[PDB]
Structure 1
Amino acid sequence: WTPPRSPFNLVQETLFHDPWKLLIATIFLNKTSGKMAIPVLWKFLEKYPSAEVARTADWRDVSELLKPLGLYDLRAKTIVKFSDEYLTKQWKYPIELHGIGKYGNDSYRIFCVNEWKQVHPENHKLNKYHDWLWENHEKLSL
């Protein structure tokens, strides 16, 4: 399953190969424009390439990185805790993990596994992609 590229350019379209990275991106986008958050994302991943690394980070350091995105202490603590549970807690969908809600879970179920037909998003950007998927899945050979 390879989710198709869309005219709406969701960053999820390029991150689906690594579910942890995709989920970190949804967190970066919590009430934050992609325009500011995505460049900081690359800086984050460069310094924290994996859940393994992130789960051992000092959140205060992660917060300094996240500063110009707002919600910096909240999300830094979320990211460390999320990463820890991602690796050590038993889970089937990432909504069971701290810091991932319906929007992160819906993203996961559209991009990281083949469950887009069962997903019913309430996120505007996700709906755009999802509606477009329903309209075009035949043409796209899905």
Structure 2
Amino acid sequence: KWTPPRSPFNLVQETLFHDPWKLLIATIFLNRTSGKMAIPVLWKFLEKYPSAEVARTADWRDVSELLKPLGLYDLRAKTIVKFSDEYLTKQWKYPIELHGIGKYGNDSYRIFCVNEWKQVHPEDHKLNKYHDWLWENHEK
């Protein structure tokens, strides 16, 4: 039921907060990749694969072909499929428990999907732009 306040930065996390799977997929796309490259491939992925139920059943080679030439597309395709499967079948409390979700994905989830932002200390440039803005404006 948590609604993260809307910032002037319009991070992709702010668009996808309502669907934790979509937000976490966005972190897999954005992790060690520029937004200019990641963002359009991200929407094309979500358009063909709108849910974890659809992504977990895919052949990674077909996901990979869509992801080309985004850096390390084969690894990323395999990560997306195994993560989508774990997302559904595991009784996880935090996404850090899932395959392919590191501190960056967990910080994004704890800022946007659950109301734990005050306890989060991000290391990502964009997350910190949002997080710092939210520290300055939360009472207003």
TM, length-normalised to structure 1 = 0.94
Q: Displacement of 1:135 after TM fit? A: 0.4
CA distance in 1, matches of 2:23, 2:44: 15
If asked which structure has higher relative contact order (CA below 8 Å, sep 6+), I would say 2
Bigger mean CA deviation after superposition, 103-112 or 115-124:
115-124
Once residues 6 and 72 of structure 2 are traced to their aligned partners in structure 1, the CA distance between those partners, rounded to angstroms, is 30
- Offset, 1:46: 1.2
* Aligned-partner SS, 2:33: coil
| Percent identical residues | 99
Q: Distance in 2 between matches of 1:126 and 1:69?
A: 22
List runs of 5+ in structure 2 lacking aligned partners: none
Superposition deviation, residue 123 in structure 1: 1.4
- Residue 122 of structure 1 aligns to a residue in which SS? coil
In 1, distance between residues paired with 2:80 and 2:4? 25
Q: CA deviation at 1:9?
A: 2.0
Q: 2:31, 2:104 within 8 Å by CA — same for their partners in 1?
A: no
Structure 1: distance between partners of 2:107 and 2:123:
9
Query: In the TM superposition, what are the counterparts of 1:1-142 in structure 2 within 5 Å?
Result: 1-139=2-140
CA offset at residue 124 of structure 1? Answer: 1.7
Structure 1 residue 68: deviation in Å? Answer: 2.0
Distance 1:30 1:116 in 2: 19
Pairwise CA distance, 1:113: 0.7
Work out the CA distance in 2 between the residues paired with 1:76 and 1:13.
24
SS at the partner of 1:31? coil
For the residue of structure 1 that corresponds to 2:107, the secondary structure is helix
Deviation at 1:117, TM superposition (A): 0.9
1:26 Cα deviation (Å)? 0.4
Q: TM-score, normalised by structure 2?
A: 0.96
Residues 82-107 of structure 1: CA distance to partner in whole angstroms, max 9, x if unpaired? 00000001200000000000000000
- Deviations along 1:5-48, whole A, 9 cap, x unmatched? 21222110110010000000000001211122111111111111
How many residue pairs are counted as aligned between the two chains? 139
